[PDB]
């Protein structure tokens, strides 16, 4: 999966901020959230989120919906490394396994059940 | 700070209202 944040902010500066932020905020994981390519739903103003590690994916859905113009007829799916993480996983679990080496977790959203369609 | 902190407090009452156990 490809994200604008990575293209705009170069690695060693991201990894810089990841290390910093992960040490100030206990029990809060840093995650970047971008609209997927080809997705047709509301854009998200802010990308950079600190999320309680014990917060479920299920709940993270609720919090992101709250922040985009989403009609009821619109579907919404998260993607981590091209795969939909289950609603039962914790943002903590998700960070542990799939955090990249800048210490960030990258999640894309879309209205299509398959990334980038 | 460019980071937005999400807190469960937003959800907490909702979950009660919808009947979470």
Author numbering:
A (entry chain A): 1 to 117
B (entry chain B): 453 to 473
Which sentences from the paper describe this structure?
The mammalian Atg8 family (Atg8s proteins) consists of two subfamilies: GABARAP and LC3. All members can bind to the LC3‐interacting region (LIR) or Atg8‐interacting motif and participate in multiple steps of autophagy. The endoplasmic reticulum (ER) autophagy receptor FAM134B contains an LIR motif that can bind to Atg8s, but whether it can differentially bind to the two subfamilies and, if so, the structural basis for this preference remains unknown.
Here, we found that FAM134B bound to the GABARAP subfamily more strongly than to the LC3 subfamily. We then solved the crystal structure of the FAM134B–GABARAP complex and demonstrated that FAM134B used both its LIR core and the C‐terminal helix to bind to GABARAP. The structure also allowed us to identify the structural determinants for the binding selectivity. We further showed that these properties might be conserved in FAM134A or FAM134C. Our work may be valuable for studying the differential functions of GABARAP and LC3 subfamilies in ER phagy in future.
